[PDB]
Amino acid sequence: TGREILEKLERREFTREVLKEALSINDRGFNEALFKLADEIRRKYVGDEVHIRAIIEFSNVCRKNCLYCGLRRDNKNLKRYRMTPEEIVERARLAVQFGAKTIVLQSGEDPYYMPDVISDIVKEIKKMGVAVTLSLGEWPREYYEKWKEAGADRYLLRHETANPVLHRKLRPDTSFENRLNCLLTLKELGYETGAGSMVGLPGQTIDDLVDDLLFLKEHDFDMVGIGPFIPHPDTPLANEKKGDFTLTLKMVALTRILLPDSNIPATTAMGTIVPGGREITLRCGANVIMPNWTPSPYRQLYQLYPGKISVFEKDTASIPSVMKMIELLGRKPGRDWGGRKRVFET
Ligand SMILES: C[C@H](CCC(=O)NCCC[N+](C)(C)CCCS(=O)(=O)[O-])[C@H]1CC[C@H]2[C@@H]3[C@H](O)C[C@@H]4C[C@H](O)CC[C@]4(C)[C@H]3C[C@H](O)[C@]12C
Ligand SMILES: C[C@H](CCC(=O)NCCC[N+](C)(C)CCCS(=O)(=O)[O-])[C@H]1CC[C@H]2[C@@H]3[C@H](O)C[C@@H]4C[C@H](O)CC[C@]4(C)[C@H]3C[C@H](O)[C@]12C
Ligand SMILES: Nc1ncnc2c1ncn2[C@@H]1O[C@H](CSCC[C@H](N)C(=O)O)[C@@H](O)[C@H]1O
Ligand SMILES: CC1(C)S[C@](C)(C(=O)O)N[C@@H]1C(=O)O
Ligand SMILES: [Cl-]
Ligand SMILES: [Se]
C-alpha cells in the first residue's frame, strides 16, 4: 500500500524494497503524496530561496562519443564552436551584472582549454565575488587540482547511470569506475560535488533507478542533477523512447527525501519534455534553477538533446525569466552563493 511506503519514507526507512515500491506504484494519490512530502522536506531543510546558476556553454567540441549525446564526436551534422577566454569572462561579468551569484562553465570535453585556459578564466571570474562551478567532464586529477587552486568552488559530473554494464555501453570511451573515481577525487580536493543521472535510458530498469538513488545516498553529494533522457536524431539512440516525466519527477522527489539538505536543480531537460516542467519540479523537491547564459550565435549550437529550451529569446532573457518564475511560484531568489548548508542529523 502506498500509505505504508509513505510512512516508511517519512520515518526514513530507506531500504531498497521501499525505494523500488515507491518507483513501482503508479497511483495518482500515492504520487501526489510523494511530491507533497518532497516539497515539504525541501521547504523545511533548504527553505524558499531558489538559487540561480547562470550557465555558459562555452564550447561544443568533444573528444568522447557517448551514445546519447548530440555533441558526440561522431556527429558531423553540427557546427562546432569555441568561445574565446575574453568572451567567456565578459559574458560571466554580464551575468554577475544581472544578479547571478554562481557562474557555471560547461563544455564538451574540449582539449583546447585544458587545463591552463580554464584556470585563467576561473581566476578572472572569481575576482567578481561569485561562486564558480565547472562542468567539463573527466580529466586528470592534476587538472582538477589546478582548477581548485585557481578558485573553482564546485564541479558537476553526473554519474549518468550506476549500472556499470549499461554505463560502459553508453559511454564507450570510459567506465563507471572512472566516473566514480573522478567524483571521489573532486570531493577529496574540496569541491562541492554534483552527481546525478538520466532517467529512461535505453535498457535502464526500475532496479537501476533504485541503484542510482542508493548511490546518491551513499556518497552524500552536494548537488544532484536529474533529468530525462531525450533522444537526439544525430545519435545511435535516435529511435529510442524518451524518458518519462513523471518517473523522472519521482526520482527528484526521492532524491530530496534521501538527501534533504542537498541542492537539486529543476533541469532544463524537465522543461523540454513538458511545458512548465521546471516549475513543477521546483514544487516537488528542487531548489535550484540554471538559466542558459550562452550568447548567440553559439547558444543554438549546444544541442545535447533537441528542443532544448530557451533559444529564440534574446540571450539576456533567461535570468529575468527565472526571477519572474521564482516570484510567481511564491519563492525567493538566493541571497548568497547558495552553497550547501548541511543539517547534521541522526
Ligand atoms: C493546481 C492543481 C489543481 C488544483 C485545483 O484546481 N483543485 C480544485 C480547486 C481547489 N481550490 C482549493 C482552488 C478551490 C476548491 C473549491 S472548488 O469550488 O473549486 O471546488 C493542483 C492539483 C494537484 C496539485 C499537485 C499535487 O498536489 C502534487 C504536487 C504537490 C506539491 O506540494 C506541489 C506541486 C504539486 C505538483 C501540486 C501542484 C498543484 O497544487 C496541483 C497541480
Ligand atoms: C546591468 C544593468 C546596468 C547596471 C549594472 O551594471 N548593474 C550591476 C548590478 C550588480 N548587482 C546585480 C550585483 C546589483 C545587486 C543590487 S541589489 O540591491 O539587487 O542587491 C542593469 C540595469 C537595470 C538592471 C535590471 C533591473 O534592475 C531589473 C531586474 C532586477 C533584478 O534584481 C535583476 C534583474 C534585472 C532585470 C536587472 C538586471 C541588471 O542588473 C540591469 C539590466
Ligand atoms: N540526449 C540527452 N538527453 C538528456 N540529457 C543529456 C543528453 N545528452 C547529454 N545529457 C546530459 O548532459 C550532461 C552534461 S554534458 C556536458 C558536460 C560534460 N561533457 C559531461 O559529460 O559531464 C550529461 O551529464 C548528461 O546527463
Ligand atoms: C545539460 C544538463 C543536463 S546538466 C544540468 C545543468 C544539471 O542538471 O546540472 N542540467 C542540464 C539540462 O537539463 O539541460
Ligand atoms: Cl552550482
Ligand atoms: Se579523475
Query: What's the burial of 304, exposed, middle or buried (CB within 10 Å: 0-12/13-18/19+)?
Result: buried
Which ligand 1 atom lies nearest to the CA of residue 32? Answer: 28
What's the full length of the chain, in residues?
346
CA distance 179 to 318: 31
Question: Sign (positive/negative) of CA torsion 291, 304, 266, 343?
Answer: negative
Cβ(174)–Cβ(130) below 8 Å: no
C-alpha dihedral sign at 319, 324, 330, 332? positive
CA angle 267, 272, 274 (to 5 degrees): 100
- CA geometry: angle 304, 308, 313, nearest 5 deg: 135
Question: Half-sphere exposure of 112 toward its Cβ, with a 13 Å CA cutoff?
Answer: 14
- Ramachandran angles phi, psi of 198, nearest 5°: -95, 150
DSSP-derived secondary structure for 82-130: B--HHHHHHHHHHHHHTT-SEEEEEES--GGGTTHHHHHHHHHHHTTS-
Name the one residue in this structure whose C-alpha cell is 519540479. Answer: 281
Strands 192-199 and 154-156: parallel
Measured distance CA(103)–CA(101) in Å, rounded: 7
Residue 18 CA to ligand 1 center (angstroms) comes to 27
* 329 CB within 6 A, ligand 1: no
Instruction: Determine if residue 137 is left, alpha or beta; phi over 0 gives left, psi from -120 to 50 gives alpha, anything else beta.
Output: left
Look-up of cell digits 571521489 = 184
CB 262 within 8 A of CB 154: no
- Which of 78, 198, 308 best tests ligand 3's pocket when mutated (most atoms within 8 Å of CB)? 198
Would you state the cell numbers that stand for residue 3, as one nine-digit string? 500509505
Of 327, 346, 331, the residue nearest 286 (C-alpha): 331
Decide yes or no: CATH 3.20.20.70 for domain 1-346.
yes
Please state, in angstroms and rounded to a whole number, the distance separating the CA atoms of residues 217 and 5. Answer: 18
Nearest CA to ligand 6 atom 1: 182
CA dihedral for 305, 309, 310, 311, sign (positive or negative): positive
Q: Calculate how far, in angstroms, residue 174's C-alpha sits from the geometric centre of ligand 6.
A: 11
Given a contact cutoff of 8 angstroms between Cβ atoms, the answer to whether 58 and 49 are in contact is: no
Q: Are strands 102-107 and 192-199 parallel, antiparallel or unpaired?
A: unpaired
- Only one residue has cell 563507471, namely 176
Q: Please report, for residues 97, 109, 152, 193, 235, the alpha-carbon distance to residue 102 in angstroms, rounded to integers and kept in the order given.
A: 12, 21, 11, 14, 32
CA dist 144 and 137 (Å) reads 10
Residue 238 CA: distances (Å) to CA of 67, 123, 131, 234, 244: 9, 40, 36, 7, 16
Q: Could you tell me the resolution of this structure in angstroms?
A: 1.4
Are 136 and 106 contacting, i.e. CB atoms less than 8 angstroms apart? yes
- DSSP H helix total and E strand total for the chain: 13, 8
Method by which the coordinates were obtained: X-ray
Could you say which DSSP state residue 299 is in?
Answer: G
Which residue among 94, 98, 323 is best mutated to probe the pocket of ligand 2, counting the most ligand atoms within 8 A of its Cβ? Answer: 98
Element (H, E) at 293: none
Partnered with residue 103 across adjacent β-strands are 54, 132
Pairing of strands 192-199, 49-59: unpaired
- H or E segment to which residue 166 belongs: helix 164-170
Burial grade of 330 (CB within 10 A; 0-12, 13-18, 19 or more): exposed
Residues 242 and 230 sit within 8 Å (Cβ to Cβ): yes
Strand partners, 156: 194
Return d(Cα 45, Cα 34) in angstroms, integer: 17
d(CA 153, CA 21): 37
Angle at 188 between CA 286 and CA 120, to 5 degrees: 85
Return left, alpha or beta for 47; rule: phi > 0 is left, psi -120 to 50 is alpha, else beta.
left
User: Number of C-alpha atoms within 13 angstroms, CB side, residue 129?
Assistant: 3
State yes or no: cis peptide before 233, omega within 30 of 0: no
What does the alpha-carbon distance between residue 51 and residue 101 come to, in Å, rounded to a whole number?
Answer: 8
**CA Rg, the chain, in Å?**
19
Sign of CA dihedral 264, 269, 272, 274: negative
Q: Which residue has the cell 571570474?
A: 125
Q: Quick one: which atom of ligand 4 is closest to the CA of 196?
A: 8
